[PDB]
Amino acid sequence: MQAATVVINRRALRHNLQRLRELAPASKMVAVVKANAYGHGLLETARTLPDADAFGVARLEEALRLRAGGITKPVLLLEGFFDARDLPTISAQHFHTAVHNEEQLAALEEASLDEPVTVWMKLDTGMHRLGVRPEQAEAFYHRLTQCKNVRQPVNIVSHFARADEPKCGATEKQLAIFNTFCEGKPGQRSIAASGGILLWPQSHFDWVRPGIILYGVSPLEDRSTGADFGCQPVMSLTSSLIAVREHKAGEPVGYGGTWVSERDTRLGVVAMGYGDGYPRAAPSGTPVLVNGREVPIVGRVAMDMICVDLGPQAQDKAGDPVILWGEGLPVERIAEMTKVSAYELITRLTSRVAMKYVD
Amino acid sequence: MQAATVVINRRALRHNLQRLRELAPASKMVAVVKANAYGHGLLETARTLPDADAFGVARLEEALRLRAGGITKPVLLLEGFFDARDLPTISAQHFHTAVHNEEQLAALEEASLDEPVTVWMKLDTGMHRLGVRPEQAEAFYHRLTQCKNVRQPVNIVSHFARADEPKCGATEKQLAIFNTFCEGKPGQRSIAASGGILLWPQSHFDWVRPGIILYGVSPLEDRSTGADFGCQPVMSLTSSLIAVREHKAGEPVGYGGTWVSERDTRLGVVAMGYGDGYPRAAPSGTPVLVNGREVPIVGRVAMDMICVDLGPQAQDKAGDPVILWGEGLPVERIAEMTKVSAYELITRLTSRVAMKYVD
Numbered sequence: 001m002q003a004a005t006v007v008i009n010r011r012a013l014r015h016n017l018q019r020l021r022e023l024a025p026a027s028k029m030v031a032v033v034k035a036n037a038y039g040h041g042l043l044e045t046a047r048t049l050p051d052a053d054a055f056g057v058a059r060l061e062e063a064l065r066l067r068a069g070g071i072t073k074p075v076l077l078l079e080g081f082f083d084a085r086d087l088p089t090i091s092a093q094h095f096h097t098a099v100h101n102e103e104q105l106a107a108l109e110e111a112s113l114d115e116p117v118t119v120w121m122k123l124d125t126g127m128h129r130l131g132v133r134p135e136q137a138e139a140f141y142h143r144l145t146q147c148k149n150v151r152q153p154v155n156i157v158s159h160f161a162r163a164d165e166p167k168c169g170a171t172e173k174q175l176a177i178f179n180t181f182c183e184g185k186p187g188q189r190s191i192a193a194s195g196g197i198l199l200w201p202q203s204h205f206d207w208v209r210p211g212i213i214l215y216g217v218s219p220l221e222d223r224s225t226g227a228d229f230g231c232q233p234v235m236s237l238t239s240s241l242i243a244v245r246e247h248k249a250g251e252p253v254g255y256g257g258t259w260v261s262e263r264d265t266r267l268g269v270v271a272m273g274y275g276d277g278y279p280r281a282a283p284s285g286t287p288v289l290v291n292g293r294e295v296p297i298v299g300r301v302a303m304d305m306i307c308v309d310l311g312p313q314a315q316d317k318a319g320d321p322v323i324l325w326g327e328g329l330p331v332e333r334i335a336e337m338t339k340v341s342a343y344e345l346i347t348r349l350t351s352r353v354a355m356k357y358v359d
Numbered sequence: 360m361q362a363a364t365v366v367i368n369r370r371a372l373r374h375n376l377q378r379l380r381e382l383a384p385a386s387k388m389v390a391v392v393k394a395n396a397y398g399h400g401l402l403e404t405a406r407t408l409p410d411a412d413a414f415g416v417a418r419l420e421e422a423l424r425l426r427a428g429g430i431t432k433p434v435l436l437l438e439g440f441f442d443a444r445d446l447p448t449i450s451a452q453h454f455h456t457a458v459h460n461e462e463q464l465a466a467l468e469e470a471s472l473d474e475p476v477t478v479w480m481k482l483d484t485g486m487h488r489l490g491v492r493p494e495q496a497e498a499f500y501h502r503l504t505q506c507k508n509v510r511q512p513v514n515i516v517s518h519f520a521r522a523d524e525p526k527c528g529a530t531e532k533q534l535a536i537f538n539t540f541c542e543g544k545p546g547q548r549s550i551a552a553s554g555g556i557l558l559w560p561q562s563h564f565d566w567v568r569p570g571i572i573l574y575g576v577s578p579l580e581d582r583s584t585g586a587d588f589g590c591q592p593v594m595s596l597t598s599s600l601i602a603v604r605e606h607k608a609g610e611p612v613g614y615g616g617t618w619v620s621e622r623d624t625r626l627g628v629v630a631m632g633y634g635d636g637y638p639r640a641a642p643s644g645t646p647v648l649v650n651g652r653e654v655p656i657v658g659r660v661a662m663d664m665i666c667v668d669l670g671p672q673a674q675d676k677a678g679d680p681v682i683l684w685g686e687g688l689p690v691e692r693i694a695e696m697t698k699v700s701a702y703e704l705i706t707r708l709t710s711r712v713a714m715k716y717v718d
């Protein structure tokens with residue numbers, strides 16, 4: 001019938017972008033669409049959001065697919081470029097780039113481009129992933145200022161490591177470091193993504209980079225959902241039953257006989273598995289909606305199939321609609337039940353699901 | 360380009376099919392290529408194995424992509440068809456199909472096809488996922504036998520739920536049930552996949568369906584690898600470093616500051632994350648190969664990046680080769696370290712990874 005299908009709500013997506021402008025009314029928006037737009041579709045998510053001030057990607061590849069698809073809006077390379085030979089491209093495509101290491105800076109200093117490139121110097125303010133450390137930042141920053149190939153002024157970007165943990169002073173320390181370096185400097189400032197936007201109004205500055213929350217999903221693991229912030233869930237992972245079978249008490253289900261029935265019942269088989277992106281870690285009891293009502297997963301999640309307990313006289317039939325997460329079942333709820341981060345749930349899906357866009 | 364790349368060894372793949380024929384010398388092969396050939400590529404895995412007796416898929420869509428790509432060899436629909444209206448296509452495409460429920464049988468009984476379809480009746484011998492239960496099997500089987508649309512004789516297929524657990528008598532019980540039903544019946548018999556092939560020579564029968572082991576990966580969670588059975592690993596998940604940075608003692612790394620360094624060291628940043636398919640569940644300490652030597656992951660695995668500890672004077676530079684798993688690092692080893700099944704590791708990868716084929 002219909003199998004593994006990801007349904008993307010274009011109206012929810014536009015709503016969230018506008019909703020986020022209301023939360024950060026003095027900041028421009030970098031719609032973060034990396035990793036196939038967190039599973040919602042790189043190009044379609046961008047086509048949906050022409051109001052974005054820019055689009056953010058992880059890799060140069062992603063930026064080029066945007067251009068290839070007709071996106072004209074500025075694209076920000078959050079990780080910068082990996083090869084000095086890519087600068088002519090980046091210049092001609094009008095891609096904005098982060099600059100975090102000596103290789104990139106030296107590259108910019110000796111390249112010969114027909115046009116200078118807007119840059120966002122990435123400062124390491126405490127996460128210690130990418131970026132120039134405080135003691136090397138000033139000298140590094142000054143070189144970018146002297147580059148004929150760098151469009152002036154140079155902008156400043158950083159990222160939070162624990163913005164979702166308001167109780168520890170990590171975020172305030174990163175802000176302290178961020179603010180100290182930006183003092184007296186021109187050029188746009190940006191450090192906040194979903195968590196910074198929602199919980200830290202002092203971190204909005206000139207540009208904010210909504211990612212997870214843009215898709216109506218919460219960046220926090222406190223069982224809050226996108227709706228807690230007025231953002232609507234964009235994605236629905238759906239499928240269908242391919243079988244409804246009789247089952248006896250005492251009989252196990254699935255690999256390892258992991259689950260045993262204590263009653264005669266009817267089981268439903270869903271055309272969904274980890275070969276589609278659904279977490280194999282999902283325990284028996286995890287909720288799924290069959291014909292709009294919640295039923296539990298029973299036994300191990302397999303590569304292409306998932307079994308659920310329908311009840312002894314259920315009436316559900318093969319071909320009926322199944323919702324892995326969507327309307328009536330937030331992905332955050334799944335995240336909680338399976339202990340899998342919502343970020344990974346919506347993002348680590350395979351090419352086997354169909355993509356569908358509505359309204 | 361040289362970022363998230365899955366390298367597929369075509370020579371290892373051919374070697375494993377031949378190696379398996381040596382283990383099951385009197386059985387035909389159904390090369391199971393469902394779920395994008397377990398992450399190795401549906402069409403390319405099929406193109407490199409023209410010696411297979413048939414190809415097995417989960418869904419009808421997968422079978423059609425094989426035909427669309429030029430594969431002419433028989434394709435077995437392990438889950439059968441989900442819509443009675445698909446029978447005319449299945450007949451014309453010469454797809455073999457499993458039949459596990461009333462819907463499919465009744466569909467075959469009343470459809471009008473220009474040619475009959477070869478069928479594999481699915482018998483539920485104990486896994487209780489798909490298949491006709493023992494008490495309903497005889498009547499169900501007889502109807503398929505009387506179908507003008509079913510090519511005679513009808514074949515019989517089943518699947519093991521615990522073939523990897525030789526201790527418990529689950530597999531022997533499924534065999535007992537399987538053998539009892541097949542007595543006196545013509546038509547091919549098939550119940551064994553990777554585990555059955557390797558550990559149960561009494562389950563080989565007429566056709567065996569190698570899946571996991573075909574890709575040189577072990578179906579067991581006992582630390583064994585594909586090489587334990589003479590099968591060579593087909594896949595290599597590779598990438599590159601995009602940064603090598605200084606780091607100080609007492610400083611945390613990544614989201615949640617979950618790893619703290621007890622020494623001044625140098626960290627490497629890999630262009631790999633769960634947005635590519637790499638498990639977010641990977642703990643600090645999980646091994647990765649940088650320039651051929653093993654280094655530990657430190658801090659949470661992010662969507663697009665992974666940090667590793669290189670050492671205080673490590674000579675590694677951005678752009679250097681990184682191996683997530685492949686030569687010198689079996690996926691089974693990463694399975695063990697992360698507690699993620701090897702099946703899911705190789706299969707639940709996203710479309711962001713580039714596919715490369717070698718000899």
Ligand SMILES: Cc1ncc(COP(=O)(O)O)c(CN[C@H]2CONC2=O)c1O
Binds near residue numbers: 194213661
């Ligand atoms: C630099 C940057 N800006 C914005 C975002 C968007 O964050 P939210 O998703 O939280 O809004 C990310 C997230 N990249 C994250 C996503 O997961 N793993 C990462 O490393 C980021 O790295």
Ligand SMILES: Cc1ncc(COP(=O)(O)O)c(CN[C@H]2CONC2=O)c1O
Binds near residue numbers: 305391518553569
């Ligand atoms: C019907 C059938 N045949 C063969 C196999 C091959 O198994 P191996 O890889 O073990 O050999 C599977 C596994 N499908 C598995 C994959 O994991 N989940 C499943 O349902 C299967 O369902």
